[PDB]
Design a protein around this ligand. Structure first.
Ligand SMILES: CNC(=O)CCCn1c(-c2cncc3ccccc23)nc2cccc(C(=O)N[C@@H](C)c3ccc4ccccc4c3)c21
Ligand SMILES: CNC(=O)CCCn1c(-c2cncc3ccccc23)nc2cccc(C(=O)N[C@@H](C)c3ccc4ccccc4c3)c21
Lengths: 306, 306
């Protein structure tokens, strides 16, 4: 019993975090085999960020301009290349702690763990979601660029996020590990701002199924809804449209609790209408949307990775 | 910027988790040098637990009744003994991944990271507080016994909790690593229940400071108060008394923000008396009490460990 924002054990990623220094700039890099990945804006001064030309800035750099430090060991950079918005530094030592990994680009609504690091050293680990507006609500201070986000389903690390910058409203933007930004954001000092965010409807429903699994039924009602009537209502509360894909994905949780997905939609409709009336759901006084269906199955049943 | 429930990086503890089997029971052990620590109730059948004589039950067992598996590798048990409610299994092999560590007993209101494990394999990590009623609001299923809680101080792991049981309300009870229970709980099948809880006042204040640092200011006011007056309010709303030492412990945060503790207390008094009026603080509609002052400093200062 219980329900917690539960991250993956971070050790497989800890062994990968290094410090990258270029000029006066220092941030974090990810060391996998003989390559260190980090944000390409490591090569920029604050004064370059208004209109950087990365091709021009990078061609002026040599291998020994990059100081890579693993623990208190220095790694020799022997090559460098740019792939989209990430810099790949070839070093002549392969990381002996390189886990089983792959790079995955995720969809809005997906969750992952973040290992916040400073100077190549892990600070802490927390859960995040890719918001519908393609930002993440992280906790990041100066020096955190190059921190990564990942899942570790079944003993393989799936890297899905590298941290690049904080937007004016205090949320965060970055790339996948191929260097493509999530959303329309750019590694340039512009007027870019997060779009209006929405609530991840399929996740809220999953969390309501988690509450039922753990013994709370008080928010259910005798009603049902059509998919389209549910969406017409939910979008008036700035909830994301629920698709048939989302219904299908909730199937297993529907089967385990005996509550049809559109019946759970009926309950959410009423919860949006009424609020909680002084009650909580799984310790929260708000409707929580950063647990996916897969997350709920991962936690309300017991599955682990070595 | 941003504020998240942040666990410590778990890598140093992951390398210590093993699977311990005795008879039909499987749970988790903590492998440090050549000793594996786990709950002593691992030796008991369900029948035994009705009224266990652990000393007598343990003498009926021999070393090879304990099967210890570090990943794919079996460890040979060469000795066994209890300290309080913890069983100590001496093994043939010292754990080469043993971190620098201490066994520390924590106080109510202090927080720690939990590395939830099943079959000796880490599953997830989350942050918990020791409640004033000496339970923890964990997330644990069958097989999670032997999971541990810890804090990290630079390179030193401070182990402070081992998981033993879940209580009827679904909250959790355990021991320190010397096998002393937190709270008036025993490792036997008998009627046990969590006592009425209280809210950790110094932690709410710390979180209010975290909110100010992150730009949430609407609850600040012109008023200030005294310790005695505030503790009358705290007592009425089932908050822990606030002591002079709590004020001193909040000194750094009152310095980072410039808001004296008794000024912030005036804000919390008003939040308790009149509620939040549909507003939120740091993305929460209730008053969060599982962030210590040190948690706030650590997250709004970027403290790292390695
Ligand atoms: C708000 N600012 C940004 O979020 C830009 C990046 C800021 N930062 C961070 C950082 C990362 N998370 C959150 C932060 C919150 C406050 C201050 C810094 C951070 N950790 C850093 C580590 C090394 C360098 C920088 C940095 O400042 N680099 C300079 C050249 C810079 C300036 C403007 C940029 C604009 C767009 C993209 C990248 C830009 C980059 C770092
Ligand atoms: C509600 N029950 C307890 O929380 C007792 C312990 C239950 N459990 C857990 C476990 C640990 N977190 C939460 C759980 C929630 C549901 C079911 C199991 C758990 N993971 C276990 C791994 C191995 C064995 C057991 C177990 O069941 N052992 C048996 C001999 C037992 C029986 C009665 C006990 C009474 C008091 C103390 C320990 C008792 C122990 C385990």
């Amino acid at each position: 019993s219980g329900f917690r924002k539960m991250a993956f054990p971070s050790g497989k990623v800890e062994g990968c975090m290094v410090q990258v220094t270029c000029g006066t700039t220092t941030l974090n890099g990810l060391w996998l085999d003989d390559v260190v990945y980090c944000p390409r804006h490591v090569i920029c001064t604050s004064e370059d960020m208004l209109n950087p030309n990365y091709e021009d800035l990078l061609i002026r750099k040599s291998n020994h301009n990059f100081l890579v430090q693993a623990g208190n060991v220095q790694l020799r950079v022997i090559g460098h290349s740019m792939q989209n918005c990430v810099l790949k530094l070839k070093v002549d030592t392969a990381n002996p702690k390189t886990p089983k990994y792959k790079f995955v680009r995720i969809q809005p609504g997906q969750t992952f763990s973040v290992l916040a690091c400073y100077n190549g050293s892990p600070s802490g680990v927390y859960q995040c979601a890719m918001r519908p507006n393609f930002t993440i609500k992280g906790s990041f201070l100066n020096g955190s660029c190059g921190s990564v986000g990942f899942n570790i389903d079944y003993d393989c690390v799936s890297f899905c996020y590298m941290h690049h910058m904080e937007l004016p409203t205090g949320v965060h933007a970055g790339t996948d590990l191929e260097g493509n930004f999530y959303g329309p954001f750019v590694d340039r000092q512009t007027a870019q701002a997060a779009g209006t965010d929405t609530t991840i409807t399929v996740n809220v429903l999953a969390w309501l199924y988690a509450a039922v699994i753990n013994g709370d039924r008080w928010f259910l009602n005798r009603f049902t809804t059509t998919l389209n009537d549910f969406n017409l209502v939910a979008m008036k509360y700035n909830y994301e449209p629920l698709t048939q894909d989302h219904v299908d994905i909730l199937g297993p949780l529907s089967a385990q609790t005996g509550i049809a997905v559109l019946d759970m939609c009926a309950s959410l409709k009423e919860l949006l209408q009424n609020g909680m009336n002084g009650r909580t759901i799984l310790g929260s006084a708000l409707l929580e949307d950063e647990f996916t269906p897969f997350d709920v199955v991962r936690q309300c049943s017991g599955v682990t990775f070595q």
